[PDB]
Enzyme design. Structure first.
Site, PDB file in Angstrom:
ATOM      1  N   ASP A 170       9.311  -4.467  10.886  1.00 33.16           N
ATOM      2  CA  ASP A 170       9.011  -5.472  10.001  1.00 33.16           C
ATOM      3  C   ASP A 170       9.930  -6.151   9.551  1.00 33.16           C
ATOM      4  O   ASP A 170      10.221  -6.360   8.139  1.00 33.16           O
ATOM      5  CB  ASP A 170       8.432  -4.378   8.794  1.00 33.16           C
ATOM      6  CG  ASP A 170       7.292  -5.088   8.096  1.00 33.16           C
ATOM      7  OD1 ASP A 170       6.772  -6.379   8.053  1.00 33.16           O
ATOM      8  OD2 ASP A 170       6.953  -4.359   7.014  1.00 33.16           O
ATOM      9  N   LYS A 183      11.033   3.104  -4.482  1.00 33.93           N
ATOM     10  CA  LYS A 183       9.885   3.197  -4.040  1.00 33.93           C
ATOM     11  C   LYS A 183       9.070   4.253  -4.376  1.00 33.93           C
ATOM     12  O   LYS A 183       9.659   5.304  -4.133  1.00 33.93           O
ATOM     13  CB  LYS A 183      10.023   3.077  -2.434  1.00 33.93           C
ATOM     14  CG  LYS A 183       8.988   2.109  -1.838  1.00 33.93           C
ATOM     15  CD  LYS A 183       9.121   1.677  -0.277  1.00 33.93           C
ATOM     16  CE  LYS A 183      10.035   0.751   0.055  1.00 33.93           C
ATOM     17  NZ  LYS A 183      10.147   0.223   1.277  1.00 33.93           N
ATOM     18  N   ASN A 219       0.649  -1.294  -0.013  1.00 30.15           N
ATOM     19  CA  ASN A 219       0.004   0.068   0.011  1.00 30.15           C
ATOM     20  C   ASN A 219       0.650   1.240  -0.076  1.00 30.15           C
ATOM     21  O   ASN A 219       0.421   2.352  -0.229  1.00 30.15           O
ATOM     22  CB  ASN A 219      -0.924  -0.226   1.157  1.00 30.15           C
ATOM     23  CG  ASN A 219      -2.575  -0.609   0.768  1.00 30.15           C
ATOM     24  OD1 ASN A 219      -2.882  -1.773   1.146  1.00 30.15           O
ATOM     25  ND2 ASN A 219      -3.003   0.148  -0.199  1.00 30.15           N
TER      26      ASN A 219
HETATM   27  C1  LIG Z   1      12.159  -8.815  -7.520  1.00 32.94           C
HETATM   28  C2  LIG Z   1      12.417  -7.750  -6.503  1.00 32.94           C
HETATM   29  C3  LIG Z   1      13.893  -7.579  -7.026  1.00 32.94           C
HETATM   30  C4  LIG Z   1      14.276  -6.238  -6.105  1.00 32.94           C
HETATM   31  C5  LIG Z   1      13.702  -5.461  -5.150  1.00 32.94           C
HETATM   32  N1  LIG Z   1      14.146  -4.617  -4.324  1.00 32.94           N
HETATM   33  C6  LIG Z   1      13.824  -3.943  -2.961  1.00 32.94           C
HETATM   34  N2  LIG Z   1      12.393  -3.995  -2.719  1.00 32.94           N
HETATM   35  C7  LIG Z   1      12.283  -3.311  -1.752  1.00 32.94           C
HETATM   36  N3  LIG Z   1      10.833  -3.558  -1.158  1.00 32.94           N
HETATM   37  C8  LIG Z   1      10.192  -4.659  -1.731  1.00 32.94           C
HETATM   38  C9  LIG Z   1       8.704  -4.398  -1.338  1.00 32.94           C
HETATM   39  C10 LIG Z   1       7.684  -5.375  -1.788  1.00 32.94           C
HETATM   40  O1  LIG Z   1       7.937  -6.462  -1.248  1.00 32.94           O
HETATM   41  C11 LIG Z   1       9.509  -6.970  -1.383  1.00 32.94           C
HETATM   42  C12 LIG Z   1      10.313  -6.060  -0.864  1.00 32.94           C
HETATM   43  N4  LIG Z   1      10.445  -6.012   0.491  1.00 32.94           N
HETATM   44  N5  LIG Z   1      12.996  -2.485  -1.136  1.00 32.94           N
HETATM   45  C13 LIG Z   1      14.329  -2.520  -1.447  1.00 32.94           C
HETATM   46  C14 LIG Z   1      14.669  -2.851  -2.602  1.00 32.94           C
HETATM   47  C15 LIG Z   1      16.073  -2.947  -3.318  1.00 32.94           C
HETATM   48  N6  LIG Z   1      16.814  -1.871  -2.850  1.00 32.94           N
HETATM   49  O2  LIG Z   1      16.534  -3.548  -4.183  1.00 32.94           O
HETATM   50  C16 LIG Z   1      12.322  -6.167  -5.003  1.00 32.94           C
HETATM   51  C17 LIG Z   1      11.903  -7.085  -5.608  1.00 32.94           C
END
Ligand SMILES: Cc1ccc(Nc2nc(N[C@@H]3CCOC[C@@H]3N)ncc2C(N)=O)cc1
EC number: 2.7.10.2
Length: 263
Positions: free
Chosen positions: A123, A37, A16
């Site tokens: 979290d 993000k 969300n």
């Molecule tokens: C498939 C994929 C590859 C890289 C990332 N990278 C990141 N994702 C997040 N947050 C996401 C929110 C959705 O739920 C999964 C994760 N917690 N934050 C930081 C990065 C990053 N700096 O690479 C996500 C998905």
């Protein structure tokens, strides 16, 4: 702040708060691959998440590049290309137990740093651990995180949104108090997740049923193939009483000695 004309976004959604997209950010003579993000009251939350990330500097925590005010507010981070730990392990069942020990130990080093810096993550789950390589994990997702006051060892929640109840300690659910010790409980669940190859904890259960189970003194079972010592550490992390549950210094040391002892 980041200039929007130096940032390019792929439009496929990695995940969300809104969405996460991959992009490229031109920095001096090169490009840097970034995770971004994007925002779908909520403005203040992203800028709050960015303010927490700006203050942290550790090899096991995701580095933020900066914020970008454009078509919407954006938190630009260094991209962890392998993605979330839970999904990776779901798709890579061959990963060895020594490799999983190595990665959770890395999460415990990052969390020990967070605890020393007097930040609560709030979290901590396998979905919020990001893999830079198969042997290099970083903690991310500081959207619920708080910097504790100099004179306090817990954050008292007022805002009662939808919480990741399955990762929360009894004191968070019952009294809304979040400490580093509360994060140690979460870490236990994250460990269970890791050795279960990214299976969901408390499968099919409502948060309220999870709370009941825990009040009875019941806990999740040992995952297939999990070393005994790591299951034991999970049970310590799931100590009901906060004062009796270990902090991250103790947890990291236990994992470090166990990891170094592997032959
Ligand atoms: C498939 C994929 C590859 C890289 C990332 N990278 C990141 N994702 C997040 N947050 C996401 C929110 C959705 O739920 C999964 C994760 N917690 N934050 C930081 C990065 C990053 N700096 O690479 C996500 C998905």
């Amino acid at each position: 702040y980041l200039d929007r004309k130096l940032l390019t976004l792929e439009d496929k959604e990695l995940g969300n708060f809104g969405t996460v997209k991959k992009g490229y950010y031109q920095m001096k003579k090169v490009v840097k691959t970034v995770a971004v993000k994007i925002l779908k009251a909520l403005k203040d939350e992203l800028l709050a998440e960015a303010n927490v990330m700006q203050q942290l500097d550790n090899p096991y925590i995701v580095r933020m590049i900066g914020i970008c005010e454009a078509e919407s507010w954006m938190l630009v981070m260094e991209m962890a290309e392998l993605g979330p730990l839970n999904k990776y392990l779901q798709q890579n069942r061959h990963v060895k137990d020594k490799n999983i020990i190595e990665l959770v130990h890395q999460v415990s080093m990052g969390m020990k740093y967070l605890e020393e810096s007097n930040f609560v993550h709030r979290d901590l789950a396998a979905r919020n651990v990001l893999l830079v390589t198969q042997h290099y994990a970083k903690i991310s997702d500081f959207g619920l995180s708080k910097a504790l006051r100099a004179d306090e060892n817990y954050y008292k929640a007022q805002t009662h949104g939808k919480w990741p109840v399955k990762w929360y300690a009894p004191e968070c659910i019952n009294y809304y108090k979040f400490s580093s010790k509360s994060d140690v409980w979460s870490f236990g669940v994250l460990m269970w997740e890791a050795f279960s190859y990214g299976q969901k904890p408390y499968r099919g259960m409502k948060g309220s049923e999870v709370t009941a189970m825990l009040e009875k003194g019941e806990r999740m079972g040992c995952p297939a193939g999990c070393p005994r010592e790591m299951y034991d550490l999970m049970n310590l992390c799931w100590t009901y009483d906060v004062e009796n549950r270990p902090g991250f210094a103790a947890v990291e040391l236990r994992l470090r000695n166990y990891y170094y002892d592997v032959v």
